[PDB]
Paper text:
The 9-mer peptide is seated in a more extended conformation and is held in peptide binding groove in a canonical fashion by primary anchor residues, namely P2-Thr (P2 anchor residue) and P9-Lys (PΩ anchor residue). For [name]*11:01-ATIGTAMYK complex, residues P1-Ala (solvent exposure: 0.4 Å2), P2-Thr (0.0 Å2), P3-Ile (9.3 Å2), P7-Met (0.6 Å2) and P9-Lys (8.1 Å2) show the lowest degree of solvent exposure and are therefore, buried deep in the peptide binding groove. Whereas, residues P4-Gly (49.3 Å2), P5-Thr (33.4 Å2) and P8-Tyr (59.3 Å2) display the highest degree of solvent exposure and are oriented toward the exterior of the binding groove. The side chain of P2-Thr of 9-mer forms direct hydrogen bond with Glu63 and Asn66, as well as through its main chain amino group it is directly hydrogen bonded to Glu63. Additionally, the main chain carbonyl group of P2-Thr is stably held by forming a direct hydrogen bond with Arg163. The F-pocket of peptide binding groove of [name]*11:01 is characterized by negatively charged backdrop made up of Asp74, Asp77 and Asp116 residues, and which is suitable to accommodate positively charged residues, lysine or arginine. This is evident from a salt-bridge contact between the side chain Nζ-ammonium group of P9-Lys and Asp116. Additionally, main chain amino group of P9-Lys makes a direct hydrogen bond with Asp77 and carboxylate of P9-Lys forms direct hydrogen bond with Tyr84 and Thr143, and also interacts with Asp77 and Thr80 via water molecules. The data for each pHLA complex was recorded with two different protein batches, resulting in an average melting temperature (Tm) of 33 °C for [name]*11:01-ATIGT + AMYK and 70 °C for [name]*11:01-ATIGTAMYK. The higher Tm-values for 9-mer peptide clearly demonstrate the preference for canonical mode of peptide binding to [name] molecules.
Human leukocyte antigen class-I ([name]-I) molecules are responsible for presenting endogenous peptides mainly generated by proteolytic machinery on the surfaces of cytotoxic [name]+ T lymphocytes. In particular, peptide binds to pocket-B and pocket-F with the help of anchor residues P2 and PΩ, respectively. We employed a well characterized [name]*11:01-[name] restricted peptide ATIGTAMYK derived from BRLF1 protein product Rta (134–142)28 to investigate the stability of [name]*11:01 molecule in complex with shorter peptides (<8-mer).
Residue numbers in the entry:
A (entry chain B): 1 to 99
B (entry chain A): 1 to 274
C (entry chain C): 1 to 9
Write the structure that this text describes.
């Protein structure tokens, strides 16, 4: 049995246009651990993305945080793009500053 | 006033692509404090919290030796289990191990844990008595007989009631300014029209520690769960957590609704109204 | 601090 990731995309701090922040993509509930997470700016890959150390929950499913420094603006669109063996194609989740 | 220490190990085979990946992480409560990764350059256990950086080189040397020895056990065990199950050498498989201890407010031992999975399902677990094992299937019964012969439960119990508790107490004292402090949630409400007829109210809790929290919605004083949504608690990236709860309401009726926030760091529960 | 024993299966 394989488990598909849950995905949340959000900022460290409430977004303020022109103020430096961190863009986060939190993936959880997945198995097995191999997973591909990119963060996108206007559809293009963000070059520098770091991630937390792999850990797991009581049901043995894994969780990871992927993150980049960013400065939000009114017009730039951010997103996370996740691939996993459970996904028939990559899943793109858009950043909404109100979620 | 109760506290926990946990270690989480993961080994993943990579047939055709070298030796297995091994990752170890340690936590006190909701705070990660150490890590090891087979694929990192250092080949050393590394600090992840400020209060562990004070430990001396003998501490880092010993922790490194221990996790390297477990990584080599896991490599061998991935082969052993493959053979018990008659699995192909072409497949990637996973071993996961959790262990650690809980202490009460007086520092006394509450209980210990050691549990193991294979491919994300229970394989073998140390029972709460720390004196016997539960095997999940016939392959794990082989391992159980091996561990019974080896007195493995006594080894585990000696650590869990001894070293584990003594070091958790040490970390709680050295790290007290953060581990024993609560950060209450910073709370606010947002409002998001859907149409002229409906709107979303979203109640936010940000920057809190520890992770446990309750957010609830009320309509005219009564708990409402219809037409609500609660997101899973998520890390902020800085050691704190975030959560929100939302309700869809009829436009004009927003001020009927309240959100209540409960957290250990709050002198009193918070109420929010739009 | 981690356990020192590693248990083979």
């Amino acid at each position: 049995i394989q488990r598909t990731p849950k995905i949340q995309v959000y900022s460290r701090h409430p977004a303020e246009n022109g103020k430096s922040n961190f863009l986060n993509c939190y993936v959880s509930g997945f198995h097995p651990s191999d997973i591909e997470v990119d963060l996108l700016k206007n559809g293009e890959r963000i070059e520098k993305v770091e991630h937390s150390d792999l850990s797991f929950s009581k049901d043995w499913s894994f969780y990871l945080l992927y993150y980049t420094e960013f400065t939000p603006t009114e017009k730039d669109e951010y997103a996370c793009r996740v691939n996993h063996v459970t996904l028939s194609q990559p899943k793109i989740v858009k950043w909404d500053r109100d979620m | 006033g109760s506290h926990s220490m946990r270690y989480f190990y993961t080994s993943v085979s990579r047939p055709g692509r070298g030796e297995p990946r091994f990752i170890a992480v340690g936590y006190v409560d909701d705070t990660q404090f150490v890590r090891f990764d087979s694929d990192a350059a250092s080949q050393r256990m590394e600090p992840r919290a400020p209060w562990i950086e004070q430990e001396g080189p003998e501490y880092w040397d010993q922790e490194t030796r221990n996790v390297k020895a477990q990584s080599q056990t896991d490599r061998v065990d991935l082969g052993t289990l493959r053979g018990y199950y008659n699995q192909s050498e072409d497949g990637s498989h996973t071993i996961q191990i959790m262990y650690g201890c809980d202490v009460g407010p007086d520092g006394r031992f509450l209980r210990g844990y050691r549990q193991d999975a294979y491919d994300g399902k229970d394989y073998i677990a140390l029972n709460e008595d720390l004196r016997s094992w539960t095997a999940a299937d016939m392959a794990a019964q082989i391992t159980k007989r091996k561990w019974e012969a080896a007195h493995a439960a006594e080894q585990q119990r000696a650590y869990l009631e001894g070293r584990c508790v003594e070091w958790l107490r040490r970390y709680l004292e050295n790290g007290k300014e953060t581990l024993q402090r609560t950060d209450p949630p910073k709370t606010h409400m947002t409002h998001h029209p859907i149409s002229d007829h409906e709107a979303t109210l979203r109640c936010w809790a940000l920057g809190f520690y520890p992770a446990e929290i309750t957010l609830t919605w009320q309509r005219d004083g009564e708990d409402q769960t219809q037409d609500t949504e609660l997101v899973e608690t998520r890390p902020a990236g800085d050691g704190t957590f975030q959560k929100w709860a939302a309700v869809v309401v009829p436009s004009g009726e927003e001020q009927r609704y309240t959100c209540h926030v409960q957290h250990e760091g709050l002198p009193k529960p918070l109420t929010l109204r739009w | 601090a981690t356990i020192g024993t590693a248990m083979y299966k």
